[PDB]
């Protein structure tokens, strides 16, 4: 309504990976055993 025929038609990332990151291995942990074997038990 405002005589704006120019305004009539409008014409116009990887997350990251931490350094600490790592899978827990059965070492550096005093709660459990300290080996990994195929079919021991």
């Amino acid at each position: 309504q405002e005589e704006s025929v120019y305004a009539l038609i409008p014409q116009p990332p990887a997350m990251h990976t931490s350094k600490f990151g790592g899978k827990t291995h059965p070492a550096q942990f005093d709660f459990g055993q300290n080996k990994v074997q195929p079919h021991a038990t």
């Binding site: 309504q1 405002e2 005589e3 704006s4 025929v5 120019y6 305004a7 009539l8 038609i9 014409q11």
Partner: protein
Amino acid sequence: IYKVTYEPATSRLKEELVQTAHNDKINGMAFPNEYSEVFATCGTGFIRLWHLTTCRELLRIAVPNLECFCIAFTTDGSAILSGWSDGKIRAFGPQSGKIIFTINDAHQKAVTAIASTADSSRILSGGEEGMVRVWRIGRTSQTLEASMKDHKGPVNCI
């Protein structure tokens, strides 16, 4: 032109509008200043707006009975002026909303040519009964001055 797809399986009938076209005797063309992508067509029933790359008409501002003549864009990018067979000029906008103003009895009958100043401060109207006039236009107040430029016949162009 409609594409009516009907399936009797569920008895469902849906229509689509493929293409539209003007009715008859497109009177006037208009380009918005410094714009080569959209244009406007004044016809014998109402004003339609189209664009360049595709037909895909944008809107149809309707006036029921009397026909439009010599559609015009106010300079520098502004309202659309349209003089009708009534002898009256009317202004619309981009979405064109509601009539910006109606200069009524702008001529005796059937105003035929319409032009604007480069400053969008006055509007020329050449009528079919061989007369030329100009109206001064403020921002929200219109000025009806009495130029009365007499010409020898219908004003085809201004």
